[PDB]
Amino acid sequence: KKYSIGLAIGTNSVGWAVITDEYKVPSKKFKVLGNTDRHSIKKNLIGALLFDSGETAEATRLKRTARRRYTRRKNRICYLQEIFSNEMAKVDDSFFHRLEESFLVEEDKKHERHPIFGNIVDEVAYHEKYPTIYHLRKKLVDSTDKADLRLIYLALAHMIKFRGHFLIEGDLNPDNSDVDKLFIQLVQTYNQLFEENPINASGVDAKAILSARLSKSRRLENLIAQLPGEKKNGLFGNLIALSLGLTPNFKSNFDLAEDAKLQLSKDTYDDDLDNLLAQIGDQYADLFLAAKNLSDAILLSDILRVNTEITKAPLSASMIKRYDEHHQDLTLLKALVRQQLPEKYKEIFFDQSKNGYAGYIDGGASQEEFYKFIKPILEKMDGTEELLVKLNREDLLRKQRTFDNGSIPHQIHLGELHAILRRQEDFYPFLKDNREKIEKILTFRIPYYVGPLARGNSRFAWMTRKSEETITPWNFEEVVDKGASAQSFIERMTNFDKNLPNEKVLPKHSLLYEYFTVYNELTKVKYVTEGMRKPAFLSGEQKKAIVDLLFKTNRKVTVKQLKEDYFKKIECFDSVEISGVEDRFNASLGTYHDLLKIIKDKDFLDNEENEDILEDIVLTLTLFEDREMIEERLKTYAHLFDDKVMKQLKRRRYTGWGRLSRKLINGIRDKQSGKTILDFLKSDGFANRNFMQLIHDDSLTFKEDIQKAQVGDSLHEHIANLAGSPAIKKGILQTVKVVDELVKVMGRHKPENIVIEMARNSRERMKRIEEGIKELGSQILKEHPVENTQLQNEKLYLYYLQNGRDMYVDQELDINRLSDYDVDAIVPQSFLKDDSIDNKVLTRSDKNRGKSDNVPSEEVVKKMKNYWRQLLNAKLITQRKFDNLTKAERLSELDKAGFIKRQLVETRQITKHVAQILDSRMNTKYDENDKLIREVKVITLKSKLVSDFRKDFQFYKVREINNYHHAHDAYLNAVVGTALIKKYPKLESEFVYGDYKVATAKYFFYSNIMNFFKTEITLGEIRKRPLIETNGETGEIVWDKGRDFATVRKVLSMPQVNIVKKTEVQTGGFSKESILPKRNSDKLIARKKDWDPKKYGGFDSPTVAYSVLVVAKVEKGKSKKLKSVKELLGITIMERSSFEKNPIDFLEAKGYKEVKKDLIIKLPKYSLFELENGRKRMLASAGELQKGNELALPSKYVNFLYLASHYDNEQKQLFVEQHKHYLDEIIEQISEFSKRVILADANLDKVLSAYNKHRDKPIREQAENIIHLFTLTNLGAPAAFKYFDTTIDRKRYTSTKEVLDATLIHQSITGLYETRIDLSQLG
DNA sequence: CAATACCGTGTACCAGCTGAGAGACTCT
DNA sequence: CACGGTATTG
Ligand SMILES: [K+]
Ligand SMILES: [K+]
Ligand SMILES: [K+]
Ligand SMILES: [K+]
Ligand SMILES: [K+]
Ligand SMILES: [K+]
Ligand SMILES: [K+]
Ligand SMILES: [K+]
Ligand SMILES: [K+]
Ligand SMILES: [K+]
Ligand SMILES: [K+]
Ligand SMILES: [K+]
Ligand SMILES: [K+]
Ligand SMILES: [K+]
Ligand SMILES: [Mg+2]
Ligand SMILES: [Mg+2]
């Protein structure tokens, strides 16, 4: 009675099967609980659990942060009102009340219905004088008269509620008054250097050309046009691009060897400009200085479109400009339409359903939708030239609250705010005392490194307080410890040392950590010369010498440098051979050289006394990102260096963390030697033990202290903390649960083996392509504009990624010829089963790669390596892709053997984690030598094994027929894996978790590893094999080709498979989010307790968490007589907590009385019901049902559908043609299933007519569409499908009355344990 | 209760920690 | 996207 378990782990399924030593699936009687006739049932021990995908926490996180945003914005308004409270009471005692109740209707209003002034005359007068809030903003900024306190509040509140972004550091002081003079000064500074070839700025309207509502690039072309004998890629062209906020590269301008890309907005611009000036000289400094100057004057030309010399509120003035032009253009457009085409006027100005001005202002039409609607109308009319000009600049009839206002920095709003405060503090003293308070309310932002301002009731918070008092925008620095919080922000997330768990790992760029990495690589290098008999380790003295002379003088150390600069220069070796490193050393002393460039003091860095200091500095540069805190923490070392060095140190920041702690690296000492790990790396006699040898050596103390430092998660917690998609972690947890239930099913006997197999955006594509094209300087999107959806075509995506060129040949590709080109695998897919862009390429003909058995040929490499490097720099291909392309100049036979091995050997980390979990759960006992006793072998397989087995022995799978293929996959996994390790017991080292003992031959072996199943094999030449296959040594039978294939065939043909759909309470959003207009419908849900939706509108479409069976009574008629009822009441997500708090009260409040409490059945989604003739239904909600049966199509028809549909060989085609009649029979099957179970008369008859319509079609296509027909019978929700060209729309089960009298089936996870409840016996 | 058709919150920026893949060193 | 909510037509 021994058995094995097969598992197929996916993101929506866990297939499971139990097999004996004869590869048979057992069957058992299982008890059946409940109140029905049936006391037990026969079950095959095979099946599959289905479940809805697990979801990421991301959407939840976005919702949470937006909630915190709304809370804090409301609090901003509340702070402001609190400052205004006393004096507004003197001016208008119900102003803020009218504001808070502005949403209410006039019935529900407690005050007068005009919010600002409280009477109609003054309200109309206000709106006449101030059509938009920006009119009032500009008036309050510019005017000197005392103003109404309510208008002052409204202006400041508008600025504080919509305050703009915080993406620009420092203060901004708009001034565009002398852009022309700054541009002329730039031209003068340039012409100073180049007296031989100056630029004549006379007549160049830089103010207009550069501030035009055009792209930065567009304006570059125009301006260069104004400068004769000057070209856009010359030096002045690049300086103009610089002033415009572009990223020009001055490499060609100065004949540099390295790139000199420069961007003014980048926070690294100062050091980059110093880099460049070190290359070219400080005589050019002024040049870039001048650039900066001009750049400060035109920085915001796009949002500030008004002369800043007339008003101190140029943003509101630009909004007023939008408004005035909207008015003028609307007047003109109305007149033009009235004149030239009156019949359209209504449509344009009255029909909200159309995308006219009506839909633009009152309907749901957007500015883009509106422009698209009205542009043909404009082009048809005459007199619309300037209107079309504004239309094609996205600047016609603009609103003032638009999508593009995200550009506006908070400094602009703050400027207008401070201006209003300065104006009106002359008249209201409280505005003078609270000016900085209001400014702070606008400017204050919770720092990212502080997080929620919690008090011990937030699982997301880490902030610590200096004092226990309420935090406000004004006492934040005093109440909150910014430093401790910034530290905890990073430290709550960083690893501890796996060897010393109570120690934090070092920063990745710590000097100590890089010394460690270097010496660790160095201590395993070996060398020989002529006179040497055998390879020798480097001594301690030799390694110190190499670090000093090579690693501390070059950022990277190449093997050639090691050979010449050391062995020749120091040891006088004319020739030497090196091992332990190839080409160059992986490790390096990057931080050493950075700090050298900064402090310019080699002796300081090399002095060991300073070790700690440097560590701390790097820690501070890694831990903190706020330059002020960096300064605060580094101040204690400001005495050791001068001002300029501290200035450079601040701008020097690092990210990233290592794997080891300082205590492990250079702290713990071996008791006898008294040496740290780094000491042994520096010098260890002639043993040269490295880190792994050092921590595992029993003749040293290190291993003991590691064990002393070592130190209880649950299964759920352990699985949650794995790295992987939540969708697959769900499947992993369900897998472990399934294995537990199966073990219990076998009387708590553990299996011999467990075989596990695990199965294997348009905006990102658009972003990649935009970035690559703008990095390329290409106009390919100008000439061939593309939308993100279109990029889902593989060949077009590859076209855009390749700059429209063949990759194996330096020739342009043609878009319209994409169908004629080839997509080739760089490494051939017979070796590396990689089908991603990283291994694929668009070429005219794949023949041009060279030979199809290897990497693209050397000739192609020689041709194209420069273009490939250009694509790599633009990040249009990856380094992996470039390396695979260029490998011919560097596939050995070892590579191909390894590629096959990896085709068959699972090495994914996540599958290894599933294997670890199962292996640790099964094998818990240790033997007399304290070794683990591996009772259960956990085998892991890739899908190709069972896939090839299916395709070889005609056990074909068609996913669309039903869900059985998951269970069948589990069974085949078990069979193949157990047979495999039975045949070749050595292969355990590769397939069993935890098992380990450490080219043409291994290639042959691993390619033909599965031949032992076959009777005859064609390698190549024909090989014949015996009928009974046995173990090499034991002689145990492993495969009988005369019986075991029949066994697999009978198992795959079993009609009773335990497909279980995991019942799940629904969670998440309460309902659809659309805030719908008011309506008469009880289906409307109030958005606030007192906002009756009949007056105010609200949400509809709530999601049901789970339904509830109620047996009770309802009042009927005017008399209110009671009437016994049994019905399904869906409990929505919003009602759930209330219903669970006290269910009888909830139900009585719903209109049910005398509810039978013990007969209340909670029915989660997908709950299973059986009716008549075995027809099964699943709960989709309280009012809808899903198909609940599986169509067990006979195996012969499955294989027919596979081969006939081309899902080659002559025997297969003759079988397809000989068994053509099968088509009819298949339909018959479907029909007889539907009439019994699906119950969709109209859809079924439409399908039958469609099949009888296309009988004369090729058998291949009729099969390809019979595949689509199974959507009619598929388990789950009804869905639309298409037969050839006809469309069958889903038939929905829109009533749940029938299941109230049917049989409810409570299933365990495997579905073996059932509890059946006859619901007709209730009521 | 049909059959049927419609509908469904979206975008943008900034600061991090983590593992994993891939294909080559060194090792337990 | 998909599939459950809703209103409409009957
Ligand atoms: K019973
Ligand atoms: K966010
Ligand atoms: K009223
Ligand atoms: K020119
Ligand atoms: K609109
Ligand atoms: K015309
Ligand atoms: K609006
Ligand atoms: K290397
Ligand atoms: K940092
Ligand atoms: K292994
Ligand atoms: K729950
Ligand atoms: K959930
Ligand atoms: K969900
Ligand atoms: K269940
Ligand atoms: Mg709220
Ligand atoms: Mg709004």
Side-chain angles (χ1 to χ4, degrees):
Chain A
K1 294 178 180 180
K2 298 177 179 179
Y3 74 103
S4 263
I5 292 181
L7 300 164
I9 306 174
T11 45
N12 301 99
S13 54
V14 178
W16 61 271
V18 170
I19 64 164
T20 65
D21 62 358
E22 313 196 307
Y23 310 99
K24 300 185 173 186
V25 173
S27 65
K28 291 185 183 177
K29 290 305 180 77
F30 290 90
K31 197 160 190 53
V32 167
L33 313 180
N35 64 358
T36 72
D37 260 349
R38 174 176 289 280
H39 302 261
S40 51
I41 193 180
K42 179 192 164 181
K43 297 282 190 183
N44 296 319
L45 295 189
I46 184 179
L49 183 69
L50 308 180
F51 44 89
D52 294 328
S53 300
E55 296 174 349
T56 65
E58 189 177 10
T60 309
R61 161 164 55 83
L62 301 182
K63 256 78 168 69
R64 175 172 62 252
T65 69
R67 287 195 305 263
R68 295 203 273 247
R69 263 197 56 263
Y70 284 132
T71 299
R72 292 156 184 180
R73 182 234 259 169
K74 177 59 174 197
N75 282 333
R76 295 208 296 274
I77 298 307
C78 275
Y79 294 137
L80 186 62
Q81 289 180 9
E82 185 63 17
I83 286 166
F84 268 69
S85 189
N86 290 332
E87 290 299 314
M88 192 61 74
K90 299 181 189 184
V91 166
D92 187 343
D93 73 310
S94 69
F95 177 62
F96 293 136
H97 294 132
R98 292 199 304 282
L99 289 192
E100 296 285 346
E101 79 171 17
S102 69
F103 185 80
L104 302 187
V105 292
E106 216 203 319
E107 303 176 344
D108 301 336
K109 279 198 203 314
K110 296 177 185 176
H111 303 270
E112 209 269 350
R113 66 179 188 108
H114 293 102
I116 306 175
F117 289 111
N119 70 82
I120 183 154
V121 172
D122 299 339
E123 216 79 359
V124 178
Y126 170 85
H127 278 276
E128 264 289 332
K129 196 182 189 192
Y130 308 109
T132 84
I133 183 56
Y134 297 106
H135 292 75
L136 175 58
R137 283 174 54 161
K138 181 176 188 306
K139 184 269 166 202
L140 290 189
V141 165
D142 290 337
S143 168
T144 191
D145 311 324
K146 187 174 174 168
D148 198 301
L149 202 56
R150 295 165 289 190
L151 301 193
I152 300 170
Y153 168 80
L154 290 185
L156 310 198
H158 191 259
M159 290 164 191
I160 285 166
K161 198 176 188 187
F162 315 95
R163 53 183 185 169
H165 66 67
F166 292 77
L167 304 186
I168 290 177
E169 213 176 37
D171 304 336
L172 253 179
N173 295 326
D175 189 347
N176 60 35
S177 53
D178 41 30
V179 168
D180 289 338
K181 320 191 181 209
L182 285 170
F183 173 82
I184 294 177
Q185 183 172 251
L186 178 68
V187 169
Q188 283 186 337
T189 301
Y190 176 94
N191 291 359
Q192 183 171 3
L193 292 185
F194 313 107
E195 187 179 359
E196 281 199 307
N197 316 268
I199 296 170
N200 195 4
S202 289
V204 190
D205 192 356
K207 194 182 187 297
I209 285 165
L210 286 174
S211 78
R213 273 276 278 200
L214 308 161
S215 81
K216 297 165 179 288
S217 323
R218 245 174 161 169
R219 305 174 260 154
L220 189 43
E221 283 107 1
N222 291 333
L223 188 67
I224 286 299
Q226 290 313 312
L227 307 182
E230 201 71 36
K231 303 180 189 197
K232 180 167 151 155
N233 283 321
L235 175 62
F236 192 84
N238 291 156
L239 295 153
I240 292 301
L242 188 84
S243 200
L244 285 171
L246 301 175
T247 307
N249 188 359
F250 299 82
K251 179 162 144 214
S252 289
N253 295 340
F254 297 103
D255 196 1
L256 308 184
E258 297 175 293
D259 265 4
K261 298 177 179 177
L262 296 177
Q263 199 193 42
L264 287 166
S265 61
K266 263 172 213 177
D267 48 321
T268 80
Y269 172 81
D270 290 336
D271 300 331
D272 298 322
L273 170 55
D274 293 340
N275 185 120
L276 171 61
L277 283 194
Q279 239 153 319
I280 68 174
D282 302 80
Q283 66 279 9
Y284 297 93
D286 281 353
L287 195 58
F288 290 83
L289 177 45
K292 182 58 177 176
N293 285 349
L294 183 55
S295 158
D296 282 340
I298 62 162
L299 183 91
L300 304 167
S301 74
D302 267 293
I303 64 172
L304 302 192
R305 301 177 63 187
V306 174
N307 174 222
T308 59
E309 253 172 347
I310 297 182
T311 170
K312 288 185 197 200
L315 168 72
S316 305
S318 311
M319 293 300 100
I320 295 159
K321 186 190 174 201
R322 284 200 207 171
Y323 176 86
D324 286 328
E325 284 178 12
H326 184 145
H327 175 99
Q328 302 157 355
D329 299 356
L330 177 61
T331 305
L332 175 79
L333 170 64
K334 273 176 176 175
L336 286 176
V337 175
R338 277 277 192 239
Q339 193 171 351
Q340 308 189 31
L341 32 90
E343 64 285 15
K344 278 167 164 163
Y345 189 99
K346 186 176 180 182
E347 185 193 3
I348 297 166
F349 298 99
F350 279 94
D351 193 340
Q352 299 184 28
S353 171
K354 300 300 179 175
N355 283 352
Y357 190 70
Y360 177 61
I361 304 292
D362 292 325
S366 78
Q367 179 184 294
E368 171 160 342
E369 297 180 350
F370 172 60
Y371 288 168
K372 182 177 181 181
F373 174 87
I374 194 178
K375 185 178 180 181
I377 295 182
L378 289 194
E379 269 162 355
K380 176 158 242 217
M381 307 181 50
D382 299 301
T384 59
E385 184 176 4
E386 299 177 10
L387 300 183
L388 280 175
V389 169
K390 290 177 179 179
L391 196 147
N392 291 114
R393 293 190 171 197
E394 295 149 341
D395 189 24
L396 168 74
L397 297 156
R398 293 261 286 153
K399 300 179 178 164
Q400 295 83 68
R401 298 300 301 267
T402 55
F403 58 97
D404 67 305
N405 293 336
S407 314
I408 307 176
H410 82 279
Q411 288 89 338
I412 280 75
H413 290 305
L414 173 71
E416 292 185 2
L417 174 74
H418 168 85
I420 291 176
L421 286 178
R422 287 300 197 181
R423 287 302 195 191
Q424 298 293 318
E425 78 180 354
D426 290 337
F427 302 106
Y428 306 90
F430 85 103
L431 290 190
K432 182 174 178 179
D433 311 312
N434 291 274
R435 177 186 54 90
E436 289 182 328
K437 268 204 169 186
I438 300 169
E439 294 179 359
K440 191 53 154 175
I441 289 172
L442 191 137
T443 65
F444 174 69
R445 185 157 83 112
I446 304 185
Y448 70 85
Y449 51 80
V450 182
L453 309 183
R455 208 164 65 184
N457 294 117
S458 159
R459 74 176 185 87
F460 309 94
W462 64 89
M463 173 271 296
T464 49
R465 288 149 129 108
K466 300 153 95 132
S467 65
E468 301 174 6
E469 56 175 305
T470 300
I471 304 160
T472 73
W474 316 296
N475 60 18
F476 187 78
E477 297 177 346
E478 284 63 52
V479 184
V480 172
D481 187 343
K482 296 228 292 178
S485 299
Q487 196 167 20
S488 282
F489 168 68
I490 296 296
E491 281 191 353
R492 73 197 296 272
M493 303 193 291
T494 44
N495 275 333
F496 291 91
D497 199 326
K498 295 203 173 129
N499 309 107
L500 304 188
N502 273 325
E503 298 288 336
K504 275 296 180 173
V505 304
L506 270 164
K508 176 68 167 172
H509 301 274
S510 161
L511 286 167
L512 264 171
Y513 198 82
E514 296 198 285
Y515 279 139
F516 166 85
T517 62
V518 171
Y519 276 112
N520 200 44
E521 188 168 353
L522 211 36
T523 191
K524 286 315 187 179
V525 176
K526 280 170 164 169
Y527 71 99
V528 282
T529 52
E530 236 173 25
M532 292 186 40
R533 188 246 327 173
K534 69 168 166 61
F537 277 133
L538 297 165
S539 75
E541 291 79 19
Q542 293 180 295
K543 286 181 285 190
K544 178 182 185 177
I546 294 174
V547 166
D548 288 341
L549 303 188
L550 294 194
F551 283 80
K552 291 188 183 181
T553 68
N554 311 291
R555 304 194 69 105
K556 319 300 196 197
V557 173
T558 64
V559 172
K560 291 190 186 178
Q561 287 177 292
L562 183 66
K563 292 190 177 187
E564 162 77 8
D565 289 334
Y566 177 73
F567 281 107
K568 169 71 170 198
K569 183 180 179 182
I570 312 296
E571 312 259 3
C572 280
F573 298 162
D574 302 312
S575 298
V576 66
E577 225 65 29
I578 303 293
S579 73
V581 61
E582 312 283 295
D583 182 52
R584 63 141 216 163
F585 281 94
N586 292 325
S588 52
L589 298 180
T591 303
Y592 180 92
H593 283 283
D594 301 337
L595 300 175
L596 190 46
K597 181 175 178 177
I598 284 180
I599 69 180
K600 280 127 176 140
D601 193 6
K602 186 184 184 66
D603 287 329
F604 183 85
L605 299 174
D606 295 330
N607 191 352
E608 194 180 80
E609 306 276 75
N610 303 319
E611 182 174 297
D612 291 356
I613 299 182
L614 293 161
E615 288 308 311
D616 196 52
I617 290 181
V618 171
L619 185 55
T620 283
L621 299 181
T622 297
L623 225 28
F624 307 92
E625 190 263 345
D626 176 51
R627 261 175 272 218
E628 264 194 326
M629 312 181 61
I630 294 186
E631 175 162 34
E632 238 291 318
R633 248 177 169 245
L634 295 190
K635 189 175 180 181
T636 182
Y637 305 119
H639 63 279
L640 307 168
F641 322 99
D642 65 71
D643 269 30
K644 300 178 176 179
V645 165
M646 295 308 282
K647 184 179 187 182
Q648 300 205 262
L649 265 200
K650 295 180 41 164
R651 300 175 180 164
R652 162 84 269 158
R653 271 172 277 149
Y654 291 109
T655 64
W657 297 82
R659 324 287 311 168
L660 307 174
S661 69
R662 186 178 183 177
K663 214 221 214 188
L664 183 69
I665 285 325
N666 207 32
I668 66 178
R669 326 190 83 107
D670 170 71
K671 205 177 308 173
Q672 188 173 348
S673 53
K675 292 159 59 173
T676 67
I677 301 262
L678 186 55
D679 290 334
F680 279 105
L681 297 186
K682 279 170 174 183
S683 190
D684 181 31
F686 35 83
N688 273 31
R689 298 175 277 199
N690 69 359
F691 178 60
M692 272 305 118
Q693 291 175 317
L694 287 176
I695 68 170
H696 279 107
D697 200 320
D698 295 294
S699 72
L700 299 176
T701 303
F702 293 133
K703 185 166 133 159
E704 188 185 51
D705 294 1
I706 306 313
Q707 281 300 356
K708 180 181 179 179
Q710 301 296 12
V711 292
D713 308 10
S714 70
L715 176 63
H716 181 202
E717 292 177 347
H718 173 84
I719 291 183
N721 293 344
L722 291 183
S725 71
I728 198 58
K729 306 210 253 190
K730 185 173 190 179
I732 294 168
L733 180 54
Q734 295 306 302
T735 298
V736 178
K737 300 197 169 199
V738 162
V739 175
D740 293 330
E741 178 140 295
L742 288 190
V743 163
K744 284 186 195 178
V745 162
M746 312 296 290
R748 307 189 180 94
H749 288 295
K750 309 194 176 113
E752 51 177 355
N753 315 284
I754 303 173
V755 189
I756 65 175
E757 180 253 343
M758 196 161 320
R760 238 178 196 176
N761 38 36
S762 56
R763 67 171 289 270
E764 274 199 310
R765 291 191 157 179
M766 260 298 295
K767 179 195 285 184
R768 291 179 188 177
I769 294 191
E770 280 176 341
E771 290 178 0
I773 295 314
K774 294 173 187 178
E775 164 68 47
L776 229 52
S778 177
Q779 317 286 334
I780 193 179
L781 292 178
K782 251 76 173 180
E783 295 192 329
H784 304 104
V786 73
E787 294 178 16
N788 41 274
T789 304
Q790 308 187 260
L791 295 177
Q792 294 297 147
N793 180 19
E794 180 188 45
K795 284 187 174 179
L796 185 65
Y797 186 54
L798 283 173
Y799 176 90
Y800 280 104
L801 293 182
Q802 293 174 186
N803 201 22
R805 305 193 66 78
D806 188 324
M807 198 101 158
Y808 295 159
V809 188
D810 198 298
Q811 54 192 177
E812 276 185 349
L813 294 179
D814 190 333
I815 287 206
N816 315 288
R817 302 279 306 275
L818 283 184
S819 52
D820 294 317
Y821 304 146
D822 294 336
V823 185
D824 186 57
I826 308 174
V827 189
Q829 291 173 337
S830 69
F831 295 142
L832 178 71
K833 300 225 305 183
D834 186 3
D835 220 328
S836 70
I837 302 307
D838 289 340
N839 194 41
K840 300 187 89 180
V841 52
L842 179 61
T843 182
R844 245 182 179 87
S845 176
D846 54 4
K847 298 180 179 179
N848 292 329
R849 79 190 310 277
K851 298 182 180 180
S852 61
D853 81 307
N854 209 279
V855 158
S857 78
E858 296 189 35
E859 184 186 359
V860 187
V861 176
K862 291 172 190 159
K863 279 171 105 286
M864 313 291 307
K865 176 158 184 174
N866 289 359
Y867 163 76
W868 293 341
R869 162 141 287 111
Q870 283 152 236
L871 295 179
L872 180 58
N873 293 332
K875 301 184 177 140
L876 287 166
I877 67 168
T878 70
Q879 173 78 37
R880 163 173 192 264
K881 187 166 180 174
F882 174 90
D883 289 340
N884 282 338
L885 281 169
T886 61
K887 204 183 185 61
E889 74 184 358
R890 287 176 275 110
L891 284 176
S892 61
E893 209 74 0
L894 188 70
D895 298 349
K896 307 172 189 174
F899 282 150
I900 287 200
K901 194 191 193 260
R902 291 177 245 147
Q903 288 177 5
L904 302 187
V905 171
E906 178 61 282
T907 62
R908 268 148 74 212
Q909 209 63 236
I910 187 72
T911 73
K912 279 178 177 172
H913 287 311
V914 186
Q916 185 283 332
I917 292 175
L918 286 177
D919 170 78
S920 46
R921 277 175 83 83
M922 301 307 295
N923 311 319
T924 67
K925 298 298 183 179
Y926 295 82
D927 70 357
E928 67 270 4
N929 305 311
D930 192 60
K931 303 174 178 179
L932 180 68
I933 301 178
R934 189 145 275 127
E935 337 180 7
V936 186
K937 295 195 205 65
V938 180
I939 308 153
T940 76
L941 306 178
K942 284 198 161 184
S943 315
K944 187 184 175 180
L945 283 179
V946 159
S947 172
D948 292 348
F949 191 87
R950 283 187 178 268
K951 273 175 284 190
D952 285 355
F953 301 110
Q954 315 215 82
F955 298 133
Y956 303 131
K957 87 150 88 171
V958 185
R959 265 160 267 270
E960 298 87 316
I961 290 172
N962 47 32
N963 294 96
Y964 288 9
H965 64 266
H966 296 128
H968 291 161
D969 276 0
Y971 167 78
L972 292 179
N973 283 326
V975 168
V976 172
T978 59
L980 182 56
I981 67 149
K982 270 173 170 183
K983 181 63 181 179
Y984 306 116
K986 302 176 171 180
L987 290 188
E988 290 192 23
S989 66
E990 305 304 324
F991 287 106
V992 184
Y993 178 83
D995 195 323
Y996 72 113
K997 299 182 178 181
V998 181
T1000 52
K1002 271 202 170 190
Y1003 183 91
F1004 177 83
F1005 187 29
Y1006 281 143
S1007 202
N1008 309 114
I1009 186 69
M1010 299 281 296
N1011 286 173
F1012 78 99
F1013 279 121
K1014 308 209 187 151
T1015 308
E1016 60 181 13
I1017 315 117
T1018 309
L1019 305 190
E1021 306 261 3
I1022 279 178
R1023 311 280 304 272
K1024 306 186 285 184
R1025 270 200 86 101
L1027 209 64
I1028 288 182
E1029 294 282 356
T1030 199
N1031 189 320
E1033 289 182 356
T1034 62
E1036 194 213 1
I1037 311 96
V1038 314
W1039 197 249
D1040 185 326
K1041 299 159 192 184
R1043 287 135 188 158
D1044 300 340
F1045 283 118
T1047 289
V1048 169
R1049 216 136 38 201
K1050 183 177 181 180
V1051 170
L1052 296 205
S1053 296
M1054 291 187 306
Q1056 190 283 298
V1057 180
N1058 295 293
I1059 309 304
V1060 173
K1061 176 59 145 136
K1062 175 173 189 281
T1063 59
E1064 274 178 354
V1065 174
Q1066 298 309 105
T1067 69
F1070 288 158
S1071 71
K1072 275 178 175 186
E1073 290 175 337
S1074 299
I1075 299 145
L1076 303 179
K1078 67 183 170 142
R1079 181 216 296 159
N1080 275 338
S1081 183
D1082 46 348
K1083 295 298 181 300
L1084 272 188
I1085 297 157
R1087 313 162 58 213
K1088 232 74 193 183
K1089 190 187 179 183
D1090 300 321
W1091 294 356
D1092 165 24
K1094 287 166 168 180
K1095 312 197 197 94
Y1096 304 103
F1099 317 112
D1100 74 353
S1101 311
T1103 288
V1104 179
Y1106 55 88
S1107 303
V1108 167
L1109 173 79
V1110 293
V1111 179
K1113 288 156 182 138
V1114 298
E1115 301 173 346
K1116 175 189 180 177
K1118 182 180 182 178
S1119 65
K1120 294 189 176 189
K1121 189 177 174 179
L1122 297 190
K1123 176 185 182 181
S1124 296
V1125 292
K1126 175 168 66 176
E1127 47 187 78
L1128 263 205
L1129 171 61
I1131 304 306
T1132 74
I1133 299 175
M1134 192 176 52
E1135 301 168 319
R1136 177 178 171 188
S1137 296
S1138 164
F1139 172 77
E1140 303 184 354
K1141 180 185 177 179
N1142 201 288
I1144 293 297
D1145 269 309
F1146 186 98
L1147 286 173
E1148 265 167 12
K1150 276 273 201 269
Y1152 297 114
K1153 192 181 172 179
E1154 299 164 348
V1155 182
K1156 296 187 183 173
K1157 187 177 178 183
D1158 302 350
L1159 296 181
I1160 289 182
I1161 304 172
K1162 154 186 176 177
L1163 297 178
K1165 192 183 179 181
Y1166 309 112
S1167 293
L1168 187 49
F1169 296 99
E1170 186 178 340
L1171 302 124
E1172 80 296 335
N1173 296 327
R1175 189 179 56 107
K1176 296 182 173 185
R1177 287 288 181 274
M1178 281 189 302
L1179 226 51
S1181 62
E1184 200 172 329
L1185 298 174
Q1186 295 190 351
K1187 286 167 285 171
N1189 294 83
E1190 299 277 356
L1191 174 52
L1193 198 65
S1195 289
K1196 52 167 161 175
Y1197 307 124
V1198 184
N1199 294 317
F1200 173 91
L1201 275 173
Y1202 180 90
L1203 292 172
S1205 79
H1206 262 248
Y1207 210 70
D1208 258 337
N1209 186 313
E1210 290 177 352
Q1211 285 185 309
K1212 301 174 177 62
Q1213 190 72 30
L1214 186 60
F1215 171 87
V1216 168
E1217 291 163 12
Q1218 278 177 336
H1219 291 242
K1220 177 187 181 176
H1221 56 294
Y1222 271 3
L1223 296 182
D1224 282 355
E1225 303 180 350
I1226 294 182
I1227 299 306
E1228 181 69 10
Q1229 213 89 3
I1230 294 180
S1231 180
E1232 287 307 307
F1233 189 74
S1234 308
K1235 297 174 180 175
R1236 176 168 61 88
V1237 165
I1238 303 307
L1239 305 185
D1241 301 35
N1243 284 21
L1244 175 61
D1245 293 19
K1246 196 172 178 186
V1247 161
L1248 296 173
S1249 302
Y1251 170 72
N1252 279 308
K1253 170 189 174 185
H1254 284 89
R1255 281 175 174 272
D1256 312 349
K1257 278 295 183 176
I1259 305 169
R1260 170 167 170 169
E1261 307 177 23
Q1262 280 190 85
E1264 288 169 349
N1265 290 273
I1266 286 185
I1267 301 300
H1268 289 175
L1269 284 183
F1270 290 97
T1271 305
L1272 180 73
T1273 55
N1274 272 345
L1275 174 88
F1281 56 102
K1282 297 176 183 177
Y1283 191 74
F1284 281 96
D1285 285 349
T1286 309
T1287 293
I1288 315 304
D1289 181 60
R1290 49 176 169 150
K1291 195 272 172 169
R1292 295 227 248 157
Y1293 307 120
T1294 62
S1295 173
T1296 57
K1297 181 190 177 66
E1298 53 179 12
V1299 296
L1300 306 163
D1301 295 313
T1303 297
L1304 171 69
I1305 299 169
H1306 285 296
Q1307 304 179 282
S1308 74
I1309 186 165
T1310 53
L1312 306 179
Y1313 301 111
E1314 283 183 8
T1315 294
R1316 297 173 172 256
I1317 302 294
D1318 192 356
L1319 296 182
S1320 80
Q1321 294 165 35
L1322 259 54

